[PDB]
Amino acid sequence: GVVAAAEKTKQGKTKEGVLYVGSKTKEGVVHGVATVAEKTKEQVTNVGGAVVTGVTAVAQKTVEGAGSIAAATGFVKKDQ
Amino acid sequence: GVVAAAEKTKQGKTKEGVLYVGSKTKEGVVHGVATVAEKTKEQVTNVGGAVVTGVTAVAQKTVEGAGSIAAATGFVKKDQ
Amino acid sequence: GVVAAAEKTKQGKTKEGVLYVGSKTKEGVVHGVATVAEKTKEQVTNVGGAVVTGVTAVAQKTVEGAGSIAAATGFVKKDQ
């Protein structure tokens, strides 16, 4: 088996704070997620989480919830 | 099996805070999610989460809920 | 078996703080996640977590929740 399980359980005066992000840039180039190829048979890309791309990227309190991904590629059963 | 499970369960005076993002840029180029290829057979892309792309990208409290993805490509059963 | 399990359980006046990020740059180039190849058969990419890419990337309190990934590629059962 190639199974995969994950669980989480909860049985439940603070200040949040400050997050300051200042960016001064010029002539920026960014590639978040890239798959380049030549003479390929399959190209699968599954995004279950969060992909934050930019010239100024900020992520806060992003991934705390339940999600599942199940991928299976190839599988050539060429008996004779 | 290629199964995949995930669960979450809950049995339930704070200040949120401050998030300041200032960006001064010029001539920016951004690619969030890209798949380039030549002479391919399949190109699948499933987005179950969040993809935030820009010159100034901010994500807050994004992915906390239930979702599932199930992909299967190829599968050539060429018996003779 | 190629199984994989993970669990978490909880049975439950502080100041958050300060996070200052200042960036002054010029002619930046960034590649977050890249897979280059030639004459390939499969190219799978599953994102269950968080990918933060940029010229100025900040991540705070990102990955605390339940998620699962299950991938299986190849699997050539070529008996004769």
Side-chain angles (χ1 to χ4, degrees), chain A residues 1-15 17-80, chain B residues 1-15 17-80, chain C residues 1-15 17-80:
Chain A
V2 188
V3 315
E7 293 153 87
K8 196 183 192 301
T9 314
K10 288 179 52 186
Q11 312 289 129
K13 195 169 181 62
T14 80
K15 190 173 189 299
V18 170
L19 195 142
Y20 178 100
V21 169
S23 162
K24 172 171 183 178
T25 184
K26 157 172 152 52
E27 213 283 324
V29 172
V30 176
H31 302 265
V33 166
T35 76
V36 194
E38 294 180 353
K39 189 179 256 296
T40 316
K41 292 289 180 67
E42 276 87 34
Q43 258 183 347
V44 195
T45 298
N46 293 318
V47 172
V51 182
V52 182
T53 314
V55 185
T56 300
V58 175
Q60 173 177 295
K61 292 197 177 58
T62 47
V63 183
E64 302 66 1
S68 83
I69 307 179
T73 79
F75 277 71
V76 50
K77 194 185 302 180
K78 54 166 305 309
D79 45 351
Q80 269 292 339
Chain B
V2 188
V3 315
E7 293 153 87
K8 196 183 192 301
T9 314
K10 288 179 52 186
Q11 312 289 129
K13 195 169 181 62
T14 80
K15 190 173 189 299
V18 170
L19 195 142
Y20 178 100
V21 169
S23 162
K24 172 171 183 178
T25 184
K26 157 172 152 52
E27 213 283 324
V29 172
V30 176
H31 302 265
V33 166
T35 76
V36 194
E38 294 180 353
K39 189 179 256 296
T40 316
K41 292 289 180 67
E42 276 87 34
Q43 258 182 347
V44 195
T45 298
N46 293 318
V47 172
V51 182
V52 181
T53 314
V55 185
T56 300
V58 175
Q60 174 176 295
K61 291 197 178 58
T62 47
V63 183
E64 302 66 1
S68 83
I69 307 179
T73 79
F75 277 71
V76 50
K77 194 185 302 180
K78 54 166 305 309
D79 45 351
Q80 269 292 339
Chain C
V2 188
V3 315
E7 293 153 87
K8 196 183 192 301
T9 314
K10 288 179 52 186
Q11 312 289 129
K13 195 169 181 62
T14 80
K15 190 173 189 299
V18 170
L19 195 142
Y20 178 100
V21 169
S23 162
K24 172 171 183 178
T25 184
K26 157 172 152 52
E27 213 283 324
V29 172
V30 176
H31 302 265
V33 166
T35 76
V36 194
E38 294 180 353
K39 189 179 256 296
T40 316
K41 292 289 180 67
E42 276 87 34
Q43 258 183 347
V44 195
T45 298
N46 293 318
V47 172
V51 182
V52 181
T53 314
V55 185
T56 300
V58 175
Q60 173 176 295
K61 292 197 177 58
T62 47
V63 183
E64 302 66 1
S68 83
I69 307 179
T73 79
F75 277 70
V76 50
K77 194 185 302 180
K78 54 166 305 309
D79 45 351
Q80 269 292 339

